[PDB]
């Protein structure tokens, strides 16, 4: 009967973690930052509208130059926009129209897409002679691709619906490392600013902090009551925010290893589809199912504005690395650049 | 501005190819194929002729897209909204697995999956074309086995007509949206024809209701 003994030991071990986390909860983020003055009402005007998608937009990603962005939609096309002049630099037809994620390489030579086909496809934008062509189709995942992020021009980290994340090598196409430990489908991931670590929120209402080099989980964060749909690292790299299906957001601290603040309102009952931070980290922008994007003050957990310009569910959110714009895609097949 | 004006007409050239492909996609009928794995979906796809399998077939100058997502083995809720907008849903149920078990008999598993997809929030008006395959093996099996194995509340003769009609009505009873969507039931043989015709008929009804939405009559 060793199974019962192991299960009983885990319960005591789990209680030890909760006791230690409760000891370090000296105060609350709300109490500490009660003195700081609020940011006030924030009004953002739609500076640009990008049209050309004929189906729901499921993902977007800004370029590192804060001028180009790539958007994915279920009409089977990956479109690269010039966010200053609305112009379309590229239009990439995908083999499978069921695309649910998009990525833009930090160098800018590659983009990636994936979805229900269980394959992440790398597209070469440099194209020394001709047009955009596929470079490497990374197969090996069992479930649908939910997220993908470029570490560099040769390494990409992906999360799938088979409860596992992976680390790939574009040159060889093989999984360098496989991250296991989730019990539900992994819905999103966010690379750290130092690229060494990343987090992943899955449907089991848990967020796990992984190590890219070693390949094993370090810290586990709980507190959500539903599937985590989006994750995003704080600009400092020592915190992150989660967006779940219970219409609430949570800010976890890596060093404190526990929840810090929550962003909930009795008005909103619609879950969050995408979260994003501002450049300074003071604002936490979250996209909701009730057709409006929200701006939260991450230090005071107070509403600061509404980006209401979409007709359907907001699916993707992004903030430029420069920090002077916010692009918001949604299921009405339109992207809007705010402020 | 010479290079800036030349990039503008590149966007306009990209614009018109987006619309040309958008028109071509809008003329295609999208169908979602579901089942219990061994429910005969492999038989059905041949009748109309990892990840997601797309099947292309045509009938009476109409182009159909049929997506099979039976190899996903993931949480259905997270990716089921991608198919919100298909013309119809083709459901395959094997009539011969009313007594086989996966525990729980396989027939109740299909009724559990059918109930979830029929009452889904994303599918409130999409028509469901229910195919009950393996009617030949089901006909022979009831001669030596009773339907009471599956449903303990059944009270009727062990004949094909009485038992088969009893299975169909239990599948239509799981529909709670009885007034906004319709369920088309067809008893399919392993080697039979006119299966694509029944799909075409139930798809045309969706088009007529779709057309009457634009004109405001319906």
């Amino acid at each position: 009967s060793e199974l019962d003994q192991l299960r009983q030991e885990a319960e005591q071990l789990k209680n030890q973690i909760r006791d230690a986390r409760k000891a370090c909860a000296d105060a609350t983020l709300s109490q500490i930052t009660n003195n700081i003055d609020p940011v006030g009402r924030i009004q953002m005007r739609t500076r640009r509208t990008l049209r050309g998608h004929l189906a729901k937009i499921y993902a977007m990603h800004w370029g590192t130059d804060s001028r180009l962005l790539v958007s994915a939609s279920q009409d089977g096309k990956l479109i690269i926009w010039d966010s200053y002049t609305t112009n379309k630099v590229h239009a990439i037809p995908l083999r499978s129209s069921w695309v649910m994620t998009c990525a833009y390489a930090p160098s800018g030579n590659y983009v990636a897409c994936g979805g229900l086909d269980n394959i992440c496809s790398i597209y070469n934008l440099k194209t020394r002679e001709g047009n955009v062509r596929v470079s490497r189709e990374l197969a090996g995942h069992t479930g649908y691709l939910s997220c993908c992020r470029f570490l560099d021009d040769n390494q990409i980290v992906t999360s799938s619906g088979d409860t596992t994340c992976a680390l790939w090598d574009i040159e060889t196409g093989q999984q360098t490392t496989t991250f296991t430990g989730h019990t539900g489908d992994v819905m999103s991931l966010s690379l750290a600013p130092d690229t060494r670590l990343f987090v992943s929120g899955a449907c089991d209402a848990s967020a796990k902090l992984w190590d890219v080099r070693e390949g094993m989980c370090r810290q586990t964060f709980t507190g959500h009551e539903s599937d985590i749909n989006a994750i995003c690292f704080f600009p400092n790299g020592n915190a992150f925010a989660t967006g779940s299906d219970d219409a609430t957001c949570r800010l976890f601290d890596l060093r404190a290893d526990q929840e810090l603040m929550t962003y909930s309102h009795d008005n909103i009952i619609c879950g969050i589809t995408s979260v994003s931070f501002s450049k300074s980290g003071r604002l936490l922008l979250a996209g909701y199912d009730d057709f409006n994007c929200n701006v939260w003050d991450a230090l005071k957990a107070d509403r600061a504005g509404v980006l209401a310009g979409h007709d359907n569910r907001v699916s993707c959110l992004g903030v430029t690395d420069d920090g002077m714009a916010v692009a918001t895609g949604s299921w009405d097949s339109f992207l809007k650049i705010w402020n | 501005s010479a290079e800036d004006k030349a990039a503008v007409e590149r966007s306009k050239m990209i614009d018109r190819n987006l619309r040309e492909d958008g028109e071509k996609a809008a003329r295609e009928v999208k169908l979602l194929l579901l089942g219990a794995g061994e429910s005969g979906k492999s038989t059905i796809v041949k009748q109309m002729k990892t990840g997601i399998v797309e099947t292309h077939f045509t009938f009476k100058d109409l182009h159909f897209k049929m997506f099979d997502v039976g190899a996903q083995r993931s949480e259905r809720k997270k990716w089921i909204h991608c198919f919100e907008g298909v013309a119809a849903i083709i459901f395959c149920v094997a009539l011969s697995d009313y007594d086989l078990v996966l525990e729980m008999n396989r027939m109740h598993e299909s009724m559990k999956l059918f109930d979830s997809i029929c009452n889904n929030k994303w599918f409130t008006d999409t028509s469901i074309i229910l195919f009950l395959n393996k009617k030949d093996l089901f006909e022979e099996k009831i001669k030596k086995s009773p339907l009471t194995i599956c449903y303990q509340e059944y009270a009727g003769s062990n004949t094909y007509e009485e038992a088969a009609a009893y299975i169909q009505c239990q599948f239509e009873d799981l529909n709670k949206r009885k007034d906004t969507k319709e369920i088309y039931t067809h008893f399919t043989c392993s080697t039979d024809t006119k299966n694509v015709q029944f799909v075409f008929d139930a798809v045309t009804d969706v088009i007529i209701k779709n057309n009457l939405k634009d004109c405001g009559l319906f």
Partner: single-chain antibody
Amino acid sequence: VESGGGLVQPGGSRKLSCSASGFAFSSFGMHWVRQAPEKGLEWVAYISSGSGTIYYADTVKGRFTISRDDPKNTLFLQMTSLRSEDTAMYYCVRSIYYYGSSPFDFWGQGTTLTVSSDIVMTQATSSVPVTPGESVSISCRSSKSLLHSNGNTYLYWFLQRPGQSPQLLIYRMSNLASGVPDRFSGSGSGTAFTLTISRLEAEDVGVYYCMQHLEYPLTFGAGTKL
């Protein structure tokens, strides 16, 4: 690659052809830059992708006609009234225009035929010492400033090695073309521009041309041979 052309004729008419090969010809705008037997390069005509905007030089505005055939990957140039001023080597140049594109990247081999306001680019210097291992700088000046409102100066640097077609070194003020070693640098002040070579190799000798791209009657700079 791309090649094809015509031959000698007495004061008549001829049609030039170019055969594209394996670079998605349908999405590239093509020029017809020409070079006289011992003068510098001179632009002739232009046809955009999809046969949209078409431009001609002021000296060939009515006589010449440029057309393209996206199927079969062939570009045409119809020359009707051929004078004694237009005997030259006609090069075919591909160019694509998007946000980060590099126009004039690839040049055709070019063929010879004999018959028997605008912005002027000065490039006053015409000859420099040929010693290797030094750091030579090639200067250029423009009639009007090439710094447009969007913030990038449309000045292109080309290098024609003696015996072959010109090759693009630097597109716009400082952006370096693909395959060009980092020895070449570009600095400009909107009107005056310089091209810097750190260390001279045996293959760096030749004539260097400078071209503007602000307004479409675009002109070259007569070259600065090494």
